[PDB]
Amino acid sequence: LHKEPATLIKAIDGDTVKLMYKGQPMVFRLLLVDIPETKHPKKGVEKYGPEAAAFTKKMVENAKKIEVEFDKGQRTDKYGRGLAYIYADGKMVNEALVRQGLAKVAYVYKGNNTHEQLLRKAEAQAKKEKLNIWS
């Protein structure tokens, strides 16, 4: 897996960020996390959703360097969002969110599972520390 530079354009939600990637604007969906939604079609804002969105937002807004890492499965979803691991100054946003108990590890979609175990480990730790959604 290769990390590629991107530039933040706008954070949209806990699980979705808009980046300039290889010259064009593009929306990315964070791989392997199920985050309380804030822009949830149905149910709307959820418990911890605003907190997950603020966290994601703060992490990418204060980063000097944003990198995107595609996995080896399918690279876009049906809505045209890129499916990737996002790095803020070398720290993986996907992992941060789970470790902080602000998201759960989602099912593995279309062969995109390279960091699945890394994330399930983070999620066990947050579960043991009764963090936020595991409060």
Curated annotation (Swiss-Prot):
It is found in: Secreted. Residues 115-131 have a biased composition (Basic and acidic residues). It comes from the Bacteria. Residues 115-135 are annotated as: Disordered. Ca(2+) binds at residues 15, 34-35. Coiled coil: none annotated. The active site is at residues 29, 37, 81. This is Nuclease A. It comes from Staphylococcus aureus.
